[PDB]
């Protein structure tokens, strides 16, 4: 017998054991695909789908900009950027009709937010492009740097607290011809044009395709904030709802389309996935959506929300760091940057790389590639969902005006569509009508990724529905191991980490019990705190056994005092000290918690009681400095070479150069070469 796990699916249906088709369950050790070559393919393909549109030269940027929208209808099934303003607005009009007040009410809620929201909020987030130092950085550091420039230039409104005021500074920053920053080391000077490029920049990383600047990020929040309040009011929107709360939505939409359905009426679900979602739908279209939502609203609110799409329609994509080269014989390697990829020769590259550079070079302006059409991944997730839902919305019996009708679920690019009709030809029609109505707003269903079957089974956001049941398994298990704070904390954290993965990440109990076991195993090994009754040898073995013998109620003892692990599914929310509180001996508890103890620090999102276990760990000179000072007598060297063989190598070079020019005699040259071979015979052994 040759073992073949896939033959399971002969007995078990694929939805039941879908858990077995996810190879890793956890982040793998590569996540490759964010090179400079990869960024230029995004820039090219983004234009290639949108290539029949109007080319303009930007007045402020001086950048070639493509506008595919209100452009020529597609005659092939390849991805089209050519959206249709009249169609988008109509989809958004019929949404507000089908959900009366949704926009007006959701604006009122968001007008409450935009004021109350604080600059503090902006520090939370992934990698950011820091335009201050022309690098990617942590979010909080990128803001501190940005306010330091805005403090140096007359832009002190940010120091009021609220976010809307920080934006008011970002607005005024564009109008200013100079932009100066005191970089503590040097006053640093950027002209209005070079500043504007960096304010509208997307930069690639090694931790998404590319992160945006700190200027643009502010507005993106308030837009997604509006896009949230909308999604919240839509049944079809799969965002931003919780874990088990979402499995319901799958059950609902089937139960809706299957109870009405009589004998005749067919029902097919299509497992949906939209192709090149970000590269097609154009910023100008999001501006068209926002302005239609915020009609009959105050101008200030309309404006702040309008800013994000505008910046994204004028944006530039920096090409990471650049290309790395290598000489075979010469044994060199050199990194040509992005800045000097425009002013560089084309003849050095390979066949695949040349064409990619020859296509993008028209767009290349100041070491950045102009990208007016499309977007960068996971930026307007929620707003893009509204647009998606607006096309699902147009599947009501009324809007179709036919014997076929549709409903389903949408969340960003992933979707699920249920089409009903009295016969097969009817279904085929309903599908086409959705597929094509989608093309008019820049939504290109992936024929490769997508498939269709009779209603009863489908997938949506990796929830695998099969006749009313969705399979239950965690797709990302966390480090079950020690946290490295101290005995007291790590226990709480470790036990908390498992509970949280059960409630959020849909982790099964049996798996959580084993998860708990592997934590405790690591915990006891790390802190040498193996149970008191065991025979294992460490330094602590003695102390813990002496305590074990002394102690009457041993179930009282904490795991860090050689006690038994009392945790299980039910307990995991309780702190250990609380859990075992009643079972502790009076004197043990007396010592464990006595705050006169020398271990706790200053006598006084994890929950831990302060005990003796709440301790704090730690963070010749003549003979190291003696070797380093003799190195200065040789160099008032080769990087990889050690100290002695970069000292003995400098000696023979000065020996043979002082022998030619005539500084030392034949006697004093022979003495150096003799001593230089006594040092080499001490090294080898």
């Amino acid at each position: 017998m040759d073992v073949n796990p896939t033959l399971l699916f002969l007995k078990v249906p694929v939805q039941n054991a879908i858990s077995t088709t996810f190879p890793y369950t956890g982040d793998p050790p590569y996540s490759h695909g964010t090179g400079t070559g990869y960024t230029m393919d995004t820039v090219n393909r983004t234009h290639k789908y949108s290539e029949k549109g109007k080319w303009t030269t930007n007045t402020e940027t001086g950048a070639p900009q493509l506008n595919p929208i209100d452009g020529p209808l597609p005659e092939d099934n390849e991805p089209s950027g050519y959206a249709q303003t009249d169609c988008v607005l109509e989809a958004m009009a019929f949404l507000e009709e089908s959900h009366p007040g949704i926009f007006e009410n959701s604006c009122l809620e968001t007008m409450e937010i935009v004021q109350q929201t604080r600059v503090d909020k902006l520090t939370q987030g992934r990698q950011t492009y820091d335009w201050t130092l022309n690098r990617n950085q942590p979010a909080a550091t990128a803001l501190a740097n940005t306010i330091e420039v805005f403090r140096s230039n007359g832009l002190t409104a940010n120091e009021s607290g609220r976010l809307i005021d920080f934006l008011k500074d970002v607005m005024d920053s564009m109008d200013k011809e100079e932009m100066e920053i005191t970089t503590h080391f040097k006053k640093q000077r950027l002209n209005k044009r070079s500043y504007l490029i960096r304010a509208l920049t997307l930069n690639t990383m090694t931790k998404a395709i590319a992160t945006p600047g700190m200027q643009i990020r502010g507005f993106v929040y308030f837009v997604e904030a509006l896009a949230r309040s909308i999604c919240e009011k839509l049944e079809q929107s799969g965002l931003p709802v919780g874990g088990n709360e979402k499995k319901a939505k799958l059950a609902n939409v089937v139960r809706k389309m299957m109870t009405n359905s009589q004998d005749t009426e067919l029902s097919f679900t299509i497992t949906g996935d939209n192709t090149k979602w970000n590269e097609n739908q154009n910023p100008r279209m999001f501006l068209a959506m926002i302005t239609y939502i915020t009609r009959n609203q105050p101008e200030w609110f309309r404006n702040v929300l309008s800013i994000a799409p505008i910046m994204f329609s004028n944006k530039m994509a920096r090409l990471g760091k650049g290309y790395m080269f290598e000489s075979k014989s010469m044994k060199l390697r050199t990194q040509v940057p992005a800045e000097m990829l425009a002013n560089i020769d084309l003849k050095y590259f390979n066949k695949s790389t040349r064409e990619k550079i020859e296509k993008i070079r028209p767009l290349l302006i100041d070491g950045t590639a102009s990208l007016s059409p499309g977007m960068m991944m996971g930026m307007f997730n929620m707003l893009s969902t509204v647009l998606g839902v607006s096309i699902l919305n147009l599947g009501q019996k009324k809007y179709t005006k036919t014997t076929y009708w549709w409903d389903g679920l949408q969340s960003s690019d992933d979707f699920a569509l249920i089409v009903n009709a009295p016969n097969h030809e009817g279904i085929q029609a309903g599908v086409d009508r959705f597929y094509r109505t989608c093309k008019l707003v820049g939504i290109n269903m992936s024929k490769k990724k997508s498939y269709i079957n009779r209603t009863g089974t489908f997938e949506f956001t990796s929830f695998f529905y099969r006749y009313g049941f969705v399979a239950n398994f965690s797709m990302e298990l966390p480090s079950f191991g020690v946290s490295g704070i101290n005995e007291s904390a790590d226990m709480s954290v470790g036990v908390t980490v498992i509970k949280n993965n059960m409630i959020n990440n849909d982790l099964g109990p049996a798996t959580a019990q084993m998860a708990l076991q592997l934590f405790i195993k690591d915990y006891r090994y790390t802190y040498r705190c193996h149970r008191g009754d065991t025979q294992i040898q460490t330094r602590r073995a003695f102390e813990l056994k002496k305590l074990w013998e002394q102690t009457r109620s041993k179930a009282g003892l904490l795991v860090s005092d050689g006690g038994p692990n009392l945790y299980n599914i039910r307990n995991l929310h309780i702190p250990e000290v609380c859990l075992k509180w009643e079972l502790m001996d009076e004197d043990y508890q007396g010592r464990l918690c006595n705050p006169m103890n020398p271990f706790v620090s200053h006598k006084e999102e994890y929950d831990a009681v302060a005990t003796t276990h709440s301790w704090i760990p730690k963070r010749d000179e003549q003979m190291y400095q003696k070797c380093c000072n003799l190195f200065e007598k040789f160099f008032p060297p080769v990087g990889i070479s050690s100290m002695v063989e970069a000292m003995v190598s400098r000696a023979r070079i000065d020996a043979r150069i002082d022998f030619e020019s005539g500084r030392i005699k034949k006697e004093e040259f022979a003495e150096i070469m003799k001593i230089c071979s006594t040092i080499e015979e001490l090294r080898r052994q």
Partner: protein, 118 residues
Amino acid sequence: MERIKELRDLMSQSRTREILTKTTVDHMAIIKEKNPALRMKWMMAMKYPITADKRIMEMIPERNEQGQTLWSKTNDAGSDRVMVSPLAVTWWNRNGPTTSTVHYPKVYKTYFEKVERL
């Protein structure tokens, strides 16, 4: 002539010898572990990884019954704190002073209330 004769002297002392053959030219500037999980495992290997007030030396003994050293008079960063073995924490929890622990259910009420529901 004098600098190369001096290099032979330092390679005859076997401690200065092991600073010249190990250390690299790049890693002389550093003479002049982001992941805390390992850093802890690393430190727990050491004799004395835990820091405490100097009063510990008056409170718990230097060695236990088996003659294991519980603390050492070592230099800590900014003040007169000393280095302590995890043995000392266990030692305290079996021979320390007993104060009245009636106020801990009431100080950590926010935490303890999770037990009352179960």
